[PDB]
């Protein structure tokens, strides 16, 4: 019962869950699987070998290529960019050499960021606008820059935690008060 | 032949106000609340939201989404695939319509190709944002800013070439193309 | 001769060679010349004063504006960005001041990179994802960053060569055995 703009093209075979919204001039390939309550903005593209979970918000001009997997509650900001071939050359087809990109639950991919294929983006990570991610991003990490480097940690709500990057510590979300534990430089929810 | 108006493939929703002599190109979608002035150009796959005002002689290149809460004064230039935003710290599971921040671009400013403006910034008159920069703080009138994140490296004339003015302090410079005079007062540049 | 998606608009006059594929909602202007075996992805734009060679792969959301020239076997990654006016101001028409961008054979332009007009990108150069190029890129140079700086040398195959960044040296691609010579910091096939 997904609603699909009449100008969108959803190829036979594609599966789109209930309450999803597909906007103007979107193309979804027939292999694609998209969950419930998603939103796909103007000119989105989705390939065949793609799984998108529930409540995923994909803004305008995002191309979700083959070998990209988005867990539930992922946010893909305006004009952010995925890839699936690491070292493309026009003369050499590298279909068989695709690298996976996995975006874990609740991660936010800022506007106009780019993700080099092969990276995993952890749960509730936050990739600043314009960043170029070329390594794995820890759960809750705030990363910015070209290439992206970690400068802090972000709570689920989306504000920085008073927690060092390394070692062992604990902190609370400035909004909800919920506690996070850092152990050897890895952040988790308590 | 005849002058282009609004390409037939564009979708201009009922209620949109578009001024005379503006050109709207292929597969543009303009929402019903928008207002767009005279003499504007909107490139391929532009999107324009409802809560948007665009002045006169605004040139918006391909693949720019002028989302709700973005406001563009006369003579602004939005380069190819530059990107605006309206939520500072988006999370898919957190509704943030009530927390949008306005982005205001003042007269004559240039936003280079593939730059990004983090919401809430104000871009000053005749500012120049280099290609690919990421703006996350206000940009003074006439400032030339580049980089991720953007830092000021000079001052640009209205004509669009750097002025011989220091970044800080008091100074004066003249545009050699027009002879227009600029005055720097404690690091703030104005046209004389 | 090309295959053209029915939603594409290819203006009268445009020349597109055999075995080319034009995908959804692409607009090609009537002065354009595109060679054989090219692929133009979703929402590509091609201007009038444009020559694109053979086997050029142009991914989604690339606008090949007037005064951009792409040699054979060029790869333009997802949402990379060309320009033709150096210092745009909406009040001043600068058609007459366009600066050329020439991309030489086999160069790769990574996803979401940007090229400031006037640059020449050398043969088999490799511009990293997200870079902003504002100076000429040597043949075979690997450049990254905003603005782009050279960090190594890429073989035709698209893997770094065992060459110093500067100086005089030689190296061999392990995949093909082809030999490269670095002379005063200029790399060429022997
Ligand atoms: C649909 C499609 O996907 S089409 C295909 C489009 N694909 C792409 O555009 C992907 C382009 N790939 C890249 O940019 C890759 O990062 C490559 C090919 C440049 C990496 O090349 P490699 O030789 O493996 O270099 P390596 O990863 O060892 O990096 C060397 C240094 O350059 C840095 N670097 C590498 N790539 C980038 C980049 N794009 N931007 C900034 N820095 C970069 C690395 O961070 C490292 O520096 P550090 O040690 O200071 O962190
Ligand atoms: C339609 C739609 O708009 S959907 C919503 C899309 N919205 C977005 O993509 C916005 C993304 N937001 C951002 O990137 C923001 O800059 C945030 C959320 C990362 C800022 O997080 P904050 O915790 O407030 O960080 P803060 O602003 O204090 O910056 C900390 C440091 O990081 C730098 N920084 C922050 N963001 C960036 C960025 N995107 N790129 C590079 N540097 C950055 C700052 O400049 C500062 O360093 P400095 O002191 O040397 O100048
Ligand atoms: C269809 C269409 O094309 S519409 C037109 C769209 N066109 C554009 O968006 C082009 C925008 N132009 C630019 O970004 C240009 O680089 C300009 C105008 C900012 C250059 O301005 P100039 O005054 O000539 O500066 P200049 O080239 O001397 O550079 C000064 C310094 O800034 C750096 N710099 C210049 N532009 C950039 C940039 N975009 N990003 C990062 N650094 C930059 C230079 O590398 C130099 O630094 P360095 O000496 O430490 O390397
Ligand atoms: O002959 C033309 C002129 C313009 N455009 C479209 O208009 C945008 C703006 O082009 P230009 O900068 O020349 O704008 P104009 O001032 O001519 O509207 C281009 O990217 C294309 O989207 C086009 O398709 N054909
Ligand atoms: O089955 C397909 C194959 C390709 N594409 C479109 O073609 C572009 C380029 O695809 P690919 O790199 O696979 O290019 P090819 O060389 O196969 O034309 C994709 O981004 C889509 O726009 C598509 O819609 N369906
Ligand atoms: O009234 C609307 C709401 C949404 N959109 C399209 O949906 C995208 C997602 O909007 P939102 O879900 O972020 O509000 C917008 O970028 C645009 O593509 C519209 O065109 N009109
Ligand atoms: Na971009």
Short mmCIF file of C-alpha atoms in Angstrom, two decimals, chain A residues 17-105:
data_model
loop_
_atom_site.label_atom_id
_atom_site.label_comp_id
_atom_site.label_asym_id
_atom_site.label_seq_id
_atom_site.Cartn_x
_atom_site.Cartn_y
_atom_site.Cartn_z
CA UNK A 17 6.35 -2.06 2.10
CA UNK A 18 3.23 -0.53 3.45
CA UNK A 19 3.10 3.19 4.24
CA UNK A 20 6.20 3.90 2.13
CA UNK A 21 6.24 6.96 -0.12
CA UNK A 22 8.02 7.08 -3.49
CA UNK A 23 8.39 10.58 -4.94
CA UNK A 24 8.86 12.14 -8.37
CA UNK A 25 11.00 10.46 -11.07
CA UNK A 26 12.35 7.72 -8.84
CA UNK A 27 13.56 4.49 -10.54
CA UNK A 28 13.45 1.25 -8.46
CA UNK A 29 14.85 -1.92 -10.08
CA UNK A 30 12.98 -5.23 -9.92
CA UNK A 31 15.28 -6.97 -7.41
CA UNK A 32 14.94 -4.24 -4.80
CA UNK A 33 13.39 -4.89 -1.40
CA UNK A 34 12.27 -1.81 0.60
CA UNK A 35 10.53 -1.97 3.98
CA UNK A 36 7.59 -0.18 5.55
CA UNK A 37 7.30 3.55 6.26
CA UNK A 38 10.21 4.50 4.01
CA UNK A 39 10.44 7.73 2.05
CA UNK A 40 12.35 8.01 -1.27
CA UNK A 41 12.83 11.56 -2.56
CA UNK A 42 12.98 13.04 -6.04
CA UNK A 43 15.31 11.24 -8.51
CA UNK A 44 16.32 8.47 -6.15
CA UNK A 45 17.66 5.33 -7.89
CA UNK A 46 17.59 1.86 -6.26
CA UNK A 47 19.38 -1.14 -7.78
CA UNK A 48 18.52 -4.76 -7.87
CA UNK A 49 20.83 -6.16 -5.18
CA UNK A 50 19.61 -3.82 -2.49
CA UNK A 51 17.84 -4.32 0.80
CA UNK A 52 16.40 -1.27 2.61
CA UNK A 53 14.74 -1.78 6.01
CA UNK A 54 11.83 -0.05 7.69
CA UNK A 55 11.45 3.70 8.30
CA UNK A 56 14.44 4.56 6.11
CA UNK A 57 14.45 8.16 4.92
CA UNK A 58 16.25 8.70 1.62
CA UNK A 59 16.43 12.29 0.45
CA UNK A 60 16.61 13.65 -3.10
CA UNK A 61 19.27 12.47 -5.58
CA UNK A 62 20.49 9.43 -3.67
CA UNK A 63 21.50 6.39 -5.75
CA UNK A 64 21.30 3.19 -3.74
CA UNK A 65 23.40 0.93 -5.94
CA UNK A 66 23.73 -2.83 -5.95
CA UNK A 67 25.45 -4.18 -2.85
CA UNK A 68 24.19 -1.40 -0.53
CA UNK A 69 22.21 -2.53 2.55
CA UNK A 70 20.42 -0.08 4.82
CA UNK A 71 19.06 -1.22 8.16
CA UNK A 72 15.99 0.22 9.86
CA UNK A 73 15.82 3.96 10.70
CA UNK A 74 18.76 4.97 8.49
CA UNK A 75 18.77 8.55 7.24
CA UNK A 76 20.37 9.27 3.86
CA UNK A 77 20.71 13.01 3.48
CA UNK A 78 20.23 15.13 0.38
CA UNK A 79 22.49 14.07 -2.50
CA UNK A 80 24.62 11.67 -0.46
CA UNK A 81 26.47 9.14 -2.60
CA UNK A 82 27.00 5.35 -2.33
CA UNK A 83 29.43 3.29 -4.41
CA UNK A 84 30.03 -0.36 -5.15
CA UNK A 85 33.25 -0.50 -7.20
CA UNK A 86 36.37 0.59 -5.32
CA UNK A 87 38.73 1.38 -8.20
CA UNK A 88 36.54 1.86 -11.34
CA UNK A 89 38.04 1.91 -14.81
CA UNK A 90 35.76 2.28 -17.80
CA UNK A 91 37.59 -0.43 -19.76
CA UNK A 92 37.39 -3.10 -17.03
CA UNK A 93 33.93 -4.40 -15.88
CA UNK A 94 34.05 -4.92 -12.15
CA UNK A 95 30.55 -6.27 -11.50
CA UNK A 96 32.13 -9.36 -9.97
CA UNK A 97 34.35 -7.27 -7.66
CA UNK A 98 31.63 -5.22 -5.97
CA UNK A 99 32.25 -4.41 -2.30
CA UNK A 100 29.32 -4.31 0.16
CA UNK A 101 28.27 -1.17 2.01
CA UNK A 102 26.35 -1.86 5.21
CA UNK A 103 24.64 0.95 7.06
CA UNK A 104 23.48 -0.10 10.50
CA UNK A 105 20.35 0.90 12.38
#
